[PDB]
Amino acid sequence: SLRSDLINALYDENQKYDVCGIISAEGKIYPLGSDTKVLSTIFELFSRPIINKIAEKHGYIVEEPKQLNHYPDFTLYKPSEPNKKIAIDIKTTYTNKENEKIKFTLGGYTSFIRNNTKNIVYPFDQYIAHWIIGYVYTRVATRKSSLKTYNINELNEIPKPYKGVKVFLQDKWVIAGDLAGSGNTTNIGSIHAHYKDFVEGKGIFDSEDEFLDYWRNYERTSQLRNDKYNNISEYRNWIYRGRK
Amino acid sequence: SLRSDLINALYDENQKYDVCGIISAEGKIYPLGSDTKVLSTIFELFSRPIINKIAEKHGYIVEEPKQLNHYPDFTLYKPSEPNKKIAIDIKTTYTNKENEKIKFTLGGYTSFIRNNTKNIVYPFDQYIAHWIIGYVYTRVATRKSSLKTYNINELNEIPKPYKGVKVFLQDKWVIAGDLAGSGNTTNIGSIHAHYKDFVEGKGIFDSEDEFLDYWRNYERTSQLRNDKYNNISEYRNWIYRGRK
DNA sequence: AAAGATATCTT
DNA sequence: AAAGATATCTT
Numbered sequence: 001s002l003r004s005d006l007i008n009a010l011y012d013e014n015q016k017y018d019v020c021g022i023i024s025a026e027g028k029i030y031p032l033g034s035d036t037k038v039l040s041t042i043f044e045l046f047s048r049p050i051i052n053k054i055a056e057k058h059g060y061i062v063e064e065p066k067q068l069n070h071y072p073d074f075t076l077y078k079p080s081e082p083n084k085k086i087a088i089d090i091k092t093t094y095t096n097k098e099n100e101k102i103k104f105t106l107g108g109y110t111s112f113i114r115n116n117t118k119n120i121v122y123p124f125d126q127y128i129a130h131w132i133i134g135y136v137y138t139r140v141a142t143r144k145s146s147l148k149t150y151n152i153n154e155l156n157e158i159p160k161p162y163k164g165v166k167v168f169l170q171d172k173w174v175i176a177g178d179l180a181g182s183g184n185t186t187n188i189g190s191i192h193a194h195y196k197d198f199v200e201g202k203g204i205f206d207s208e209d210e211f212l213d214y215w216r217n218y219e220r221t222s223q224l225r226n227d228k229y230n231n232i233s234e235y236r237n238w239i240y241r242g243r244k
Numbered sequence: 245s246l247r248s249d250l251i252n253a254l255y256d257e258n259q260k261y262d263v264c265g266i267i268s269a270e271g272k273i274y275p276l277g278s279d280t281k282v283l284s285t286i287f288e289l290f291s292r293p294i295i296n297k298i299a300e301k302h303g304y305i306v307e308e309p310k311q312l313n314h315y316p317d318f319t320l321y322k323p324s325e326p327n328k329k330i331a332i333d334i335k336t337t338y339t340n341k342e343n344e345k346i347k348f349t350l351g352g353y354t355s356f357i358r359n360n361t362k363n364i365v366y367p368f369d370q371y372i373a374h375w376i377i378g379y380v381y382t383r384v385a386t387r388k389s390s391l392k393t394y395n396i397n398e399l400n401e402i403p404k405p406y407k408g409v410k411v412f413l414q415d416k417w418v419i420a421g422d423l424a425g426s427g428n429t430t431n432i433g434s435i436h437a438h439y440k441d442f443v444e445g446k447g448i449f450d451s452e453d454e455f456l457d458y459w460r461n462y463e464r465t466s467q468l469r470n471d472k473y474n475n476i477s478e479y480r481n482w483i484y485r486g487r488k
Numbered sequence: 489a490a491a492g493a494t495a496t497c498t499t
Numbered sequence: 500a501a502a503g504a505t506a507t508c509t510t
Contacts, residue, residue: 016270017268017269017270017272018268018269018270019266019267019268019269019274020267020268020269021266021267021289022263022265022266022267022286022289022290023263023264023265023266023267023273023399024261024262024263024264025261025262025264025399025400025402025404026260026261026262026399027396027399028261029267030263030289030290030292030293031289031292031293032289033285033288033289033292033308034308035285035312035505036312036495036496036497037285037495037496037505037506038285038288038289040495040496041281041282041285042266044277044282045266045274045275045276045277045282046266046274048274048275048277048391049274049391049392049393052391052392062391064277064387064388064389065494066387067508067509068279068280068494068507068508068509069493069494069507069508069509069510070493070494071494089495091495091496092495092496093496093497094496094497104495104496105495105496105497107494107495108492108493108494110492110493111492111493111494118493118510119492119493119494119509119510142308146292147292147293147296147306148293148296148297149293152271152396155269155270155271156269158269179500179501180500180501180502181495181496182495182496182497182501182502182503183500183501183502183503183504184428184429184492184502184503184504185428185429185492185493185494185495185496185503186492186493187495187496221501221502222500222501222502230500279494280506280507280508281494281495281506281507281508284506284507309505311497311498312496312497312498312505313496313497313498313503313504313505314498314504314505315505335506335507336506336507337507337508338508348507349506349507349508351505351506352503352504352505354503354504355503355504355505362504363498363503363504363505423489423490424489424490424491425507426491426492426506426507426508427489427490427491427492427493428491428492428493428503429492429503429504429505429506429507430503430504431506431507465490465491466489466490466491474489
């Protein structure tokens with residue numbers, strides 16, 4: 001399938017290539033910084049060609065946002081199935097010690113999930129699947145040798161700000177949790193668990209319908225959630241009583 | 245001086261090299277995307293070596309944030325004078341056309357400017373200067389970046405995601421404006437003007453004291469601001485009334 | 489403008 | 500956790 005071929009290719013590319021810097025047209029190389037801002041950027045650019053190659057083999061065209069700040073990162077679709085678009089978003093997080101628990105921010109809960117055409121490349125009802133390509137890396141402190149420029153002949157000598165990168169491919173609803181991933185930027189929170197839980201799909205929602213109803217009615221602050229629901233147990237009781 | 249040698253080195257490096265992609269240790273090159281999210285990261289990595297080299301020349305140690313949401317990007321200081329630290333932040337923005345007015349977000353107005361040790365690498369009162377390295381790029385019309393990978397002999401074939409890039413170094417207070425640069429993330433706004441105004445330092449504040457006081461008492465919403473001040477003239481009237 | 493989107497993190 | 504920080508853009 002498209003999905004199995006895509007995760008096979010991402011997993012393989014991760015295993016064989018290690019990004020180590022930015023390069024200029026003149027051949028000068030600039031080492032990488034330690035942020036997640038930097039590594040989130042690197043992993044998106046590293047995935048781009050892979051996604052395009054696999055999409056093309058299943059006759060899918062790839063469209064990136066035409067305007068800035070529009071989800072998703074990549075929109076796939078066959079011209080013969082305009083209302084069966086696939087949204088792919090790349091998300092990255094870190095780990096201090098290898099294999100500690102991790103969690104991701106899964107997109108806003110107040111934009112396209114509550115308004116069909118808000119901050120999204122195509123109307124939300126034209127997508128039949130929302131996939132997350134998740135990258136996890138173990139942080140590695142920066143040192144003196146990262147603050148100089150390098151030539152092409154010193155490629156393998158450049159120090160990297162990470163180690164043990166892992167990648168998964170999973171549906172957004174499947175790995176979604178019941179607690180916000182951010183406050184003022186109102187994002188959905190993923191489950192808080194080990195990498196294997198993301199791969200296997202051990203989330204808290206029973207269906208994609210339950211995921212959507214939960215986040216579509218989740219209040220923004222603790223003061224408002226106090227009288228409604230703060231977690232999945234409370235939501236299921238709220239539902240049991242008649243949405244009250 | 246440190247400042248004049250830094251500005252010269254930045255202009256020079258910018259004039260000489262054009263960043264065109266990310267490179268792996270194995271030699272495979274992945275092209276860059278169009279975003280400001282991609283370009284802000286690229287301009288930050290590009291400036292690193294320059295800043296470290298010039299600082300070493302003048303005998304300053306350079307420290308990057310150990311924590312991830314702490315300002316500033318680069319802290320310069322001599323071991324002899326620990327209360328004479330210099331903060332350097334790299335900021336990016338775009339233009340559609342060469343001579344179109346631009347604007348920057350200049351950091352939060354509710355963190356370290358209101359709390360000495362909040363979201364800052366070293367206590368705010370240890371810093372004697374706050375510089376902005378501003379990068380302005382001209383967007384390319386193309387909306388479809390390259391989705392293939394390249395080798396080291398194909399560097400001049402890689403499409404660049406910008407038409408032209410300009411850089412400046414200026415004090416934060418000098419280019420600060422009186423209108424918020426962001427709402428929910430409460431950022432100071434810069435003046436809205438042509439590139440030359442930033443270089444020449446044609447701001448609206450009469451002093452750094454006035455800039456700090458303005459942003460330290462700026463209310464977060466229109467509702468609250470309409471009873472106090474929304475702009476520089478209203479703030480100066482607010483001062484006349486007795487800070488009430 | 490003002491307010492809230494874009495991704496992810498600390499305390 | 501919840502709430503508001505990190506940078507920047509568009510509605």
